């Protein structure tokens, strides 16, 4: 409850809200779900001046993402979707469309903001640990146990981000990850120490 508030205070320095009209209550709900991430990661994001940009429209309508217009994201071959239609982005930056958090809202991630932010944690905070030898061994055994095996089972950085999201979204998804991917669950458990 207190670390939740502390994480929300940290996020107030990371989250950028869009200009103009947007769904405020849902924006706050997205931040609330982000607050479940271990505070150690959020503070690292804050130190690197990583911004979580909440958007009222397409990602590609932002100047910094205009170069991705018409670009098919990694692993989206055959989906017919380009970055113009994708509601979330993570890595060196984080950009998220308000209202698209839940699985099925233009994506099949367990939660949009946690998945995208996990990428930034992976890349900025953990220096691409998803591509380390340790995790690749785990990814080789369990990367196909969370569905979407041609995306999660193929890219370790995506399996990491999606497992991270399962681990921190809520208690139900946390239990599901443990049963499905016990070595990944333990990996993320140790990472947070």
């Amino acid at each position: 409850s207190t670390t939740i508030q502390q994480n929300k205070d940290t996020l107030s320095q990371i989250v950028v809200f869009p200009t103009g009209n947007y769904d405020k209550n849902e924006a706050n709900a997205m931040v609330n779900r982000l607050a479940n991430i271990d505070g150690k990661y959020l503070n690292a994001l804050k130190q690197n001046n990583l911004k979580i940009k909440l958007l009222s429209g397409k990602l590609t309508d932002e100047k910094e993402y205009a170069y991705l217009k018409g670009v098919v994201p990694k692993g989206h071959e055959g989906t017919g979707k380009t970055w113009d239609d994708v509601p979330g982005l993570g890595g060196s930056t984080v950009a998220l469309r308000i209202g698209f958090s839940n699985k099925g809202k233009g994506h099949d991630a367990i939660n949009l903001e946690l998945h995208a932010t996990a990428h930034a944690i992976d890349h900025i905070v953990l220096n691409d640990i998803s591509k380390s030898a340790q995790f690749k061994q785990i990814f080789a055994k369990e990367g196909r146990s969370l569905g979407n095996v041609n995306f999660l089972g193929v890219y370790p950085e995506e399996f990491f981000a999606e497992s991270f999201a399962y681990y921190y979204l809520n208690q139900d998804t946390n239990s599901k990850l443990k049963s499905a991917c016990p070595q990944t669950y333990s990996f993320l458990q140790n990472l947070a120490k």
Partner: peptide
């Protein structure tokens, strides 16, 4: 670096 969500 950029990474998309699960399709």
């Amino acid at each position: 670096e950029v990474n998309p969500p699960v399709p």
